[PDB]
Point group: D2
Chain length 121, copies 4
């Protein structure tokens, strides 16, 4: 699948990803330091039998920003596709939802994008 | 409050298990509950939400591949669980399809879903 | 076109819209009180020759949240389609971008949805 | 700083006029500048941004109809202008197509654009 490994976004984040034979994505977000206080679980899914016509591999994953040290009361989901080859990428759009009161729910979800590469920018 | 069967008003059912560790697992099911339309979901939620009336942040992914069908796509939902008398999961979603590089710009749809524990009539 | 008139979202907002023959959308956001302090200009575009196959009319508009009284340093864009008939609607997704420092730009854009009707909820 | 010609790295040109009143007007142009590919843009921007290093919030819409072509669609861009040595407009976009009611759920694509005043080679 080409997805298992360490991935870097363009803005100082690291993700350790494992792609299981069944379509499972597992792993962690890690800080640049790699310390336990900044480590969070990721879980998601990917297409384990992509098209053989040059198409990318659809996927998504979530991190809830709680570990045994910190809780931001929020969760990010990334949706995108893996593209293999010499310039392998995961191109994604993300949504970050924060836990809010009902009055503030309308402004609970931020949107953005991330591009993941196998080496640093 | 998250564990159980969630419905939108547009024909979808999700049977969700919320684990003590922050794991979301379960399935998408069609209205007829057939194996060909059943798909794995996995995600994460805040297992220690704020105690100030805020919702519980969460997200999950389904890759639309099972042993029968493969749409070469994946949906991620980002949102929050709101408890009380009329419990809800309020979400926004991204649907990414596997595409060629030329079509990657138009690979991600956006929308929203509102889920209830009450099966529609 | 069926678009000119007063429109209400589901959450206490009013928009006064004019659809020009050339594809122009003009008008204002108005508060429930209709006072000048809460009035802001909207401008956008719509498809002035939609398909005749039951399809909706694509459109979009922007409000920058500055008037002579107030400035939130932000702007909302709505993207969607008008659907005519007895239950006429404008179904939209929105993005709200706030002016931020470069360090906070990643969290400058909120996403949501609005449904507009010709009468109050 | 907004008035002028803006380019992405993906073949698009926008000639934007920022009026003293907060109006954005102008055109999309193709790389060959032909009339068949020219479309009106209109939007709004914050004409009195914060003086603390924050960007200038803005948005605009193009409905993809002119006297030659009609795609039955419209794009909205939401973002901010950032001045200085390498001025940019950083945006996220929504593209809504006119659809039947059955296809309305999949009528809106999401993405991002980064614009510069420097024409690509």
């Amino acid at each position: 699948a080409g997805i298992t490994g360490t991935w870097y976004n363009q803005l100082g984040s690291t993700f350790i990803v494992t792609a299981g034979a069944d379509g499972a994505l597992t792993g962690t977000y890690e800080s640049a330091v790699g310390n336990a206080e900044s480590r969070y679980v990721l879980t998601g899914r990917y297409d384990s039998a992509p098209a053989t016509d040059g198409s990318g591999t659809a996927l998504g994953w979530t991190v809830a920003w709680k570990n045994n040290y910190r809780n931001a009361h929020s969760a990010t989901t990334w949706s995108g596709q893996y593209v293999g080859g010499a310039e392998a990428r995961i191109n994604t759009q993300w949504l970050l939802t924060s836990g809010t009161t009902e009055a503030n729910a309308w402004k609970s979800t931020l949107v953005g994008h991330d591009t993941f590469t196998k080496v640093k920018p």
